[PDB]
Design a protein around this ligand. Sequence first.
Ligand SMILES: *[C@@H]1O[C@H](CO[C@@H]2O[C@@H](C)[C@@H](O)[C@@H](O)[C@@H]2O)[C@@H](O[C@@H]2O[C@H](CO)[C@@H](O)[C@H](O)[C@H]2NC(C)=O)[C@H](O)[C@H]1NC(C)=O
Ligand SMILES: *[C@@H]1O[C@H](CO[C@@H]2O[C@@H](C)[C@@H](O)[C@@H](O)[C@@H]2O)[C@@H](O[C@@H]2O[C@H](CO)[C@@H](O)[C@H](O)[C@H]2NC(C)=O)[C@H](O)[C@H]1NC(C)=O
Ligand SMILES: *[C@@H]1O[C@H](CO[C@@H]2O[C@@H](C)[C@@H](O)[C@@H](O)[C@@H]2O)[C@@H](O[C@@H]2O[C@H](CO)[C@@H](O)[C@H](O)[C@H]2NC(C)=O)[C@H](O)[C@H]1NC(C)=O
Ligand SMILES: *[C@@H]1O[C@H](CO[C@@H]2O[C@@H](C)[C@@H](O)[C@@H](O)[C@@H]2O)[C@@H](O[C@@H]2O[C@H](CO)[C@@H](O)[C@H](O)[C@H]2NC(C)=O)[C@H](O)[C@H]1NC(C)=O
Ligand SMILES: *[C@@H]1O[C@H](CO[C@@H]2O[C@@H](C)[C@@H](O)[C@@H](O)[C@@H]2O)[C@@H](O[C@@H]2O[C@H](CO)[C@@H](O)[C@H](O)[C@H]2NC(C)=O)[C@H](O)[C@H]1NC(C)=O
Ligand SMILES: *[C@@H]1O[C@H](CO[C@@H]2O[C@@H](C)[C@@H](O)[C@@H](O)[C@@H]2O)[C@@H](O[C@@H]2O[C@H](CO)[C@@H](O)[C@H](O)[C@H]2NC(C)=O)[C@H](O)[C@H]1NC(C)=O
Ligand SMILES: *[C@@H]1O[C@H](CO)[C@@H](O)[C@H](O)[C@H]1NC(C)=O
Ligand SMILES: *[C@@H]1O[C@H](CO)[C@@H](O)[C@H](O)[C@H]1NC(C)=O
Ligand SMILES: *[C@@H]1O[C@H](CO)[C@@H](O)[C@H](O)[C@H]1NC(C)=O
Ligand SMILES: *[C@@H]1O[C@H](CO)[C@@H](O)[C@H](O)[C@H]1NC(C)=O
Ligand SMILES: *[C@@H]1O[C@H](CO)[C@@H](O)[C@H](O)[C@H]1NC(C)=O
Ligand SMILES: *[C@@H]1O[C@H](CO)[C@@H](O)[C@H](O)[C@H]1NC(C)=O
Ligand SMILES: *[C@@H]1O[C@H](CO)[C@@H](O)[C@H](O)[C@H]1NC(C)=O
Ligand SMILES: *[C@@H]1O[C@H](CO)[C@@H](O)[C@H](O)[C@H]1NC(C)=O
Ligand SMILES: *[C@@H]1O[C@H](CO)[C@@H](O)[C@H](O)[C@H]1NC(C)=O
Ligand SMILES: [Cl-]
Ligand SMILES: [Cl-]
Ligand SMILES: [Cl-]
Lengths: 526, 526, 526
Amino acid sequence: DDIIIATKNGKVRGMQLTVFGGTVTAFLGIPYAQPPLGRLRFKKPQSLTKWSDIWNATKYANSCCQNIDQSFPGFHGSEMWNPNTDLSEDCLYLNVWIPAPKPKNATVLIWIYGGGFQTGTSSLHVYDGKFLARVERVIVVSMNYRVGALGFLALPGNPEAPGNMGLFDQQLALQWVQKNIAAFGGNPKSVTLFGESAGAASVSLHLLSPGSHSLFTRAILQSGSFNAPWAVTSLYEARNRTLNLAKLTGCSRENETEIIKCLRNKDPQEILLNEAFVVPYGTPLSVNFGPTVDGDFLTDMPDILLELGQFKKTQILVGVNKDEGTAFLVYGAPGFSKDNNSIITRKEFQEGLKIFFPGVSEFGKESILFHYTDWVQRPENYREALGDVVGDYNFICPALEFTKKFSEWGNNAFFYYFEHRSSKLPWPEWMGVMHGYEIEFVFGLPLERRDNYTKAEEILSRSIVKRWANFAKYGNPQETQNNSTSWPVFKSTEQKYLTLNTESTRIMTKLRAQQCRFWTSFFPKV
Amino acid sequence: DDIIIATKNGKVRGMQLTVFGGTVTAFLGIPYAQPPLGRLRFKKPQSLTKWSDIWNATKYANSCCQNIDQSFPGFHGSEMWNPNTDLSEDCLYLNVWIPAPKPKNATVLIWIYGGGFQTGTSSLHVYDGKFLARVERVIVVSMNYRVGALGFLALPGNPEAPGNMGLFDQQLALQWVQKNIAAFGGNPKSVTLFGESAGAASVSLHLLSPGSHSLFTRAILQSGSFNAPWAVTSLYEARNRTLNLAKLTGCSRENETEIIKCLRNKDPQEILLNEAFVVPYGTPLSVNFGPTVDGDFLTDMPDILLELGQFKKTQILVGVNKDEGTAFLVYGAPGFSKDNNSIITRKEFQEGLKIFFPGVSEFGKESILFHYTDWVQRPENYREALGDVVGDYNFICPALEFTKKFSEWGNNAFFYYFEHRSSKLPWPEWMGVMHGYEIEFVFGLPLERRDNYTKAEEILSRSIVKRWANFAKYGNPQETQNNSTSWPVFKSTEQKYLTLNTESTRIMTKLRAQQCRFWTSFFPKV
Amino acid sequence: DDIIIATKNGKVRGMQLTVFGGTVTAFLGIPYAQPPLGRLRFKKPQSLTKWSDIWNATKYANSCCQNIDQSFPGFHGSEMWNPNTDLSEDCLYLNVWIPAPKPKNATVLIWIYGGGFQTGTSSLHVYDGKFLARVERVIVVSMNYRVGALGFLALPGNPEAPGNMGLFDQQLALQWVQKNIAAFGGNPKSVTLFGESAGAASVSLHLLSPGSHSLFTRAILQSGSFNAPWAVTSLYEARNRTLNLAKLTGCSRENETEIIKCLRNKDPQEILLNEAFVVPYGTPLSVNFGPTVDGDFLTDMPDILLELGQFKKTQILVGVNKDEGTAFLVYGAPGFSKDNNSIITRKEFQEGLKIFFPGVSEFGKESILFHYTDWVQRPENYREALGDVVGDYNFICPALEFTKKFSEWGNNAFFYYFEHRSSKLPWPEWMGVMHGYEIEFVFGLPLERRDNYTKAEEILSRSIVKRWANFAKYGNPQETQNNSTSWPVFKSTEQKYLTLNTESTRIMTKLRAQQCRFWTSFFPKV
Ligand SMILES: *[C@@H]1O[C@H](CO[C@@H]2O[C@@H](C)[C@@H](O)[C@@H](O)[C@@H]2O)[C@@H](O[C@@H]2O[C@H](CO)[C@@H](O)[C@H](O)[C@H]2NC(C)=O)[C@H](O)[C@H]1NC(C)=O
Ligand SMILES: *[C@@H]1O[C@H](CO[C@@H]2O[C@@H](C)[C@@H](O)[C@@H](O)[C@@H]2O)[C@@H](O[C@@H]2O[C@H](CO)[C@@H](O)[C@H](O)[C@H]2NC(C)=O)[C@H](O)[C@H]1NC(C)=O
Ligand SMILES: *[C@@H]1O[C@H](CO[C@@H]2O[C@@H](C)[C@@H](O)[C@@H](O)[C@@H]2O)[C@@H](O[C@@H]2O[C@H](CO)[C@@H](O)[C@H](O)[C@H]2NC(C)=O)[C@H](O)[C@H]1NC(C)=O
Ligand SMILES: *[C@@H]1O[C@H](CO[C@@H]2O[C@@H](C)[C@@H](O)[C@@H](O)[C@@H]2O)[C@@H](O[C@@H]2O[C@H](CO)[C@@H](O)[C@H](O)[C@H]2NC(C)=O)[C@H](O)[C@H]1NC(C)=O
Ligand SMILES: *[C@@H]1O[C@H](CO[C@@H]2O[C@@H](C)[C@@H](O)[C@@H](O)[C@@H]2O)[C@@H](O[C@@H]2O[C@H](CO)[C@@H](O)[C@H](O)[C@H]2NC(C)=O)[C@H](O)[C@H]1NC(C)=O
Ligand SMILES: *[C@@H]1O[C@H](CO[C@@H]2O[C@@H](C)[C@@H](O)[C@@H](O)[C@@H]2O)[C@@H](O[C@@H]2O[C@H](CO)[C@@H](O)[C@H](O)[C@H]2NC(C)=O)[C@H](O)[C@H]1NC(C)=O
Ligand SMILES: *[C@@H]1O[C@H](CO)[C@@H](O)[C@H](O)[C@H]1NC(C)=O
Ligand SMILES: *[C@@H]1O[C@H](CO)[C@@H](O)[C@H](O)[C@H]1NC(C)=O
Ligand SMILES: *[C@@H]1O[C@H](CO)[C@@H](O)[C@H](O)[C@H]1NC(C)=O
Ligand SMILES: *[C@@H]1O[C@H](CO)[C@@H](O)[C@H](O)[C@H]1NC(C)=O
Ligand SMILES: *[C@@H]1O[C@H](CO)[C@@H](O)[C@H](O)[C@H]1NC(C)=O
Ligand SMILES: *[C@@H]1O[C@H](CO)[C@@H](O)[C@H](O)[C@H]1NC(C)=O
Ligand SMILES: *[C@@H]1O[C@H](CO)[C@@H](O)[C@H](O)[C@H]1NC(C)=O
Ligand SMILES: *[C@@H]1O[C@H](CO)[C@@H](O)[C@H](O)[C@H]1NC(C)=O
Ligand SMILES: *[C@@H]1O[C@H](CO)[C@@H](O)[C@H](O)[C@H]1NC(C)=O
Ligand SMILES: [Cl-]
Ligand SMILES: [Cl-]
Ligand SMILES: [Cl-]
């Protein structure tokens, strides 16, 4: 041991790891599709022709091409999200963590990484399945999927650049688990997708894709949903951007297919560079190349499918963090530094609004100003206001609204409001419970003793881990043993959600009702 | 392209068309059965023996034999409904419009043309599927089916003239789509029939035929339903008429089969001529040769099947136009011209009644007079009254009552009251929102810019097109994106329907409750 | 006759027996697995390689290894439970009683014997299926399964001593009935498990095991349920005990598998001897080697599975006896003899508590004292109090609570409170309606005329037999013919149960509500 699994594609060697005085077998870097190179760039992921021999699956594989956030070189806070393996066009691999001893029929969890469809990789320390396998005895799988232009370049209906390639990657990863996980003792019949930010959005898209209906069982959505403003691109911009990219690399043409031929020949880095520029103005949140209505993976605008109950029927767990917005302020909002406590002026608030809502009518920005700056004298007012604006508009509202409309079609849905600030959080107090900073608690990182999270925090993680685990296994996110708070189903009438924190978890109603009325009812009209 | 599809019968070449700066592939004139000639006249449609080679499907096929309305030669208003291809006994072809690029799993719409089972053809400009394919990205199919004696000559249980042949045509067209549409990327599992007048009535008959149960998914019924007075013929008249036709062409006999032998030998035109005469007196609405209880396609009187829940269970969309009746006044009601504004006298009203209800007891006509001429002094009174009489009795009531009884068996049904007068309507103001004059808005004709419908009208059509499209795809006729009125389900209790027009669409209750009580409860008894 | 059945394993000869002037065919001692010897000790039961020839199945087979209760040598009361055939490692056989004449499609009852997973055998006189076959014309099957260390030695995940072997025995017995009972005219589709004490607990475990889902139909649970304090062992003690046993027989080691190798070589009796000693202190109720969460038969802690509806959905019949506790007092509670009427002092009561709750905090024992000794002056007070304590805590509460949570997931459940003292009961009046002393009435022993139960008692048994029989056959424990009390469904709200006794059976609510609140809500926290 020496431990080999016989996948319907070939053999793969794992590697034992120690976890809290236990063994977990890790299979890192298994290829699930055929490297999408040269002639395959911009295409749907291709079948894997069975390899002969043993695949040594003992190091994370190459992350996919992407730009790297370099606002704060050396800063953990920002860098912990940067890829930690070689960027490459060759990146369609996935990881599996089965607990040891090999389990009989384990529920499988599949992770999908966030990062605006532009950045991300499964190999991040915060996405380490090894703990979940150890503690809740499930199999955890994660995959890498193409991002930015390379994964979502869209030339509508044109099979050369049909769009949503990254999404199809994910899907092929699901098929893989479908055909193989049993060999590791996984139960293909009990599969729960979960992701965060674009990850969550992807999870939600899978609920809508018929292609995915049967590739999984349940779904968890952490800070994100397709109906978020940043998540889907109109078939119009999709084109404008594909063309803009073409111009920007001297690839303009007559035969459309030729433009793809052209681009198929540029250097990854030359593409990665211009991506930033295919829109007139951008935001800290610009998702330049994302999912589109391709009439393949997505068969119609998804708000319509959601609206009219056209999606997998099953339970869902959904939730957000107390301060989704803050993380972004520091990438362009005048007055905001990660270093000063970023008190800003009314004048600057107006300024911040211009940054996050570039194309929005002057009236539109006025309404936002008006709704959020109706003060309850206090210095931080405008600072926090702009936070919530971004928070509420990009994450918390579309999140809530998805949950709402989904449960209307008769399914159980649970909602959480995560409101705990890791005490090891490298960013400043004021950014509060930040976007993406619950992931570590979900993957159970605080369970690691020599790690310096607090006792409070170890407990919390242990609880969440269980709730999630349970939700995966039985479609019910209860913690039944340590006298916990019962987590109520989210009905479209009363709209209850559970708060997650180290003190007391409480049951509450109608999260951000006031604000989301504005974002949901009024603002789409300006 | 050059674009060939490989049907389970042979190959067929389509033809690209430009539509609002887009391509749609049209396959016009595909044969779906084996020409019903000489020995096959009056029989059920026969299997198509696979052809060798390529079928060029690039012009509409022959319309089927029928008489032609010649009240108003040169008048668009009446002539737009006349066949626009060669009449022929050889006419069992169908059209398909798939949007381009070829879609993956498109919902299919099948059109069935109206015209009292006596007239009609799929090739009419107003039945042009090319727009629907373009705009809502569905596949549209329409077929021609035998009409008048040639399609509904009934000699009950006699396999030579078993009746309902035209209906079986339609059905074979459905089987065709069932076996083939996938090759064009159609999804046989999501098929919605829709039709108008006799078309609608046919749609409704298919809900009752077991032979059709599995050949489609949903149903739309525009101004018509089997339970309409004109729609089904008693097994008695069916015979009286088959014999009368025989006498009228010197075909009378002893061996019944011989009468068919005889008639199988006359010239189409000789049959078409006498059709008009097989009844003692007729009306502008006489459907001389129609669907009968053949114990094959219809297995029992259909009002009983409807009454006792014996039909496909599924959603239905049903509706009528504000002025169904007027169109007919001008083909015999004394005082009515398309040219003068047709004010008529009480004496003439009585006269009109005689025309539309020939066989009805003197008392019967008195009740009608009495119920409708209870004035609210105004000149047009009697004119409008006679309109509604015909409207309410032939269309609006049986329409409503069908919906009612159908939804009682637990299915979702939606009802519309179409009340907009095309501004390009060749008939006079007084005829108002006329019978058959919503078809063009359903097929999206006003979407064509250089066409001179109003802006109001383009919007409306765009809306209807969507609602229909949606209803086809998801069984829900909502327009979810442009802040529209929600279209309520039609319950047998509250009876809500949605009004369709250019100003505001409203939700209302109990369409023509007063009048339909009379037509439904009282009149069948006189 | 001479009567041979052709099992998918070989032939087996039965033996006619006379029963109330009738014949019943008994097939005693059929092997259902391959003797678990030497190399197979501690393993899951192994397939039976088809034997050639006829198996004479005409005497009960060997009981399995176990210790023998020798507190009261010669006393029927205690000895009637001791094994009545040779103890042997070779003991995987089962009995079948089919009524004669061979029935067509009889409902099958499978008995599972109690005895703390430490003791028991199917051959006991009180488990004699011959009467049930005769009277209710069903097939009764019972099996022997490994007990104590030999059947539940657990070395978690280690396939050498994977734990729950006895449980798997039972399961293999169920598979057997599944594959074969038809040959005896049994209907594999209508199979009801029933058992008592550990038997019941086992029945309940089968409701949770997916491995068993499809091996039976309904379930009856007499004085016992997995959620009883004595029924499942934590994966921690399971190990501590496997090691302690190792030390105690000089079997300690490095390679775990070696410890099994070691133990695989000791003499049964050497193992049986030390079993008593693997815990620090014990109780009259100590179930030293029992079912554990093996992640095979049990796939997760069972309270969680029960809590979250993860079990076979089907009807259940559950119940307890009026005085479950008394039976145990006499194996260690100071003051209690089966010979004096065992009045005890407050000081002794405290003393008794120490015996039954050894590890429990001083506070914990105080609460018990406090809750139960709040007197209503009467001498027996403390005597009865300590009885109920043991009764309520080990049996009646966990019994009730199981029923409650089970019915919450939408299944019909019936509850009985058996409160009749056999007049042939060898123990003293004060022990009242004792643990295990309804079994004889269920198997219909009082139906035997020359047997000296009373008339009252014959009736009662006849009634129970019927109710059970009915419950097995139709999932409804009614006695429909002799004007009986209707037995209400047990809802989680009103909690009705039926009392069983010779006078009048009554419908009552909320059995031991006061006390079980304490045991269920408060005590798990001390
Ligand atoms: C679609 O793109 C056009 C062109 O974008 C420009 O050229 C690209 C290659 C890239 O370099 C971008 O940064 C450029 O902006 C857009 O037209 C531009 O944007 C606005 C028009 O609203 C205008 O201020 C700029 O001057 C235009 N650029 C030039 C020089 O033409 C346009 O925004 C996009 N179309 C829509 C409506 O989405
Ligand atoms: C808060 O800090 C921001 C960010 O400035 C950077 O970080 C600070 C710690 C400090 O070291 C600055 O010098 C760094 O540049 C300040 O934003 C700057 O403000 C002035 C105008 O007021 C302007 O000249 C800079 O270009 C600004 N930088 C940007 C791009 O916003 C801000 O003023 C500080 N606010 C307070 C009052 O604390
Ligand atoms: C069935 O038909 C008879 C005969 O119809 C007539 O002959 C046909 C060939 C055709 O030429 C029709 O126009 C003729 O009317 C019907 O009997 C006639 O109708 C009424 C009787 O109610 C009477 O006024 C006519 O004189 C009859 N014609 C003759 C000359 O016999 C009759 O209406 C039909 N039967 C029923 C009850 O439906
Ligand atoms: C309305 O018009 C009808 C239809 O008549 C035809 O069209 C008119 C525009 C006019 O040009 C007529 O001459 C055309 O014949 C009139 O109906 C006629 O009325 C008279 C008796 O009053 C009669 O001699 C004709 O035969 C009728 N035609 C028929 C078959 O109905 C009608 O009188 C006009 N009504 C008014 C007052 O406007
Ligand atoms: C697990 O077992 C240890 C050891 O049990 C002892 O040795 C066994 C072979 C057997 O002979 C037992 O009877 C022995 O008790 C337990 O430790 C003992 O129990 C308590 C500690 O709580 C203490 O009073 C004894 O002295 C310990 N025995 C010795 C001499 O070490 C212990 O109870 C078990 N562990 C747990 C926490 O369950
Ligand atoms: C009730 O009897 C118990 C059990 O004692 C045995 O059975 C009795 C019938 C009698 O014959 C005893 O001698 C037998 O030993 C008595 O328990 C004993 O009590 C005394 C102390 O009071 C003690 O010396 C013994 O060891 C005890 N035995 C045990 C292990 O409990 C009890 O005293 C009797 N109680 C009364 C008052 O009836
Ligand atoms: C794969 O890696 C392992 C590392 O221990 C080794 O046993 C084996 O030789 C390797 N096989 C190769 C060289 O591919
Ligand atoms: C695993 O569990 C499922 C139940 O969801 C079952 O159907 C499947 O056959 C099991 N496979 C095994 C026996 O491991
Ligand atoms: C409950 O808390 C106990 C500590 O008392 C711990 O052992 C266990 O892991 C906890 N369970 C969960 C699900 O948090
Ligand atoms: C069918 O029609 C098309 C028209 O372009 C042509 O390409 C082809 O030759 C035709 N085949 C024949 C003659 O049937
Ligand atoms: C098309 O869609 C249906 C779902 O209604 C599906 O069952 C069918 O297999 C699909 N065919 C494809 C994959 O195109
Ligand atoms: C909604 O209206 C917009 C114009 O603002 C138009 O682009 C779109 O087609 C409309 N949608 C429907 C379904 O009418
Ligand atoms: C089995 O036992 C019966 C007892 O009557 C007898 O008929 C038969 O000979 C026996 N067969 C043997 C010896 O195994
Ligand atoms: C016995 O009864 C079952 C009904 O539960 C039936 O399905 C099965 O085929 C029967 N076998 C026979 C005919 O004995
Ligand atoms: C009902 O009582 C009668 C005696 O009157 C008896 O024959 C019969 O067995 C009884 N039935 C049951 C189910 O006890
Ligand atoms: Cl808050
Ligand atoms: Cl009106
Ligand atoms: Cl009691």
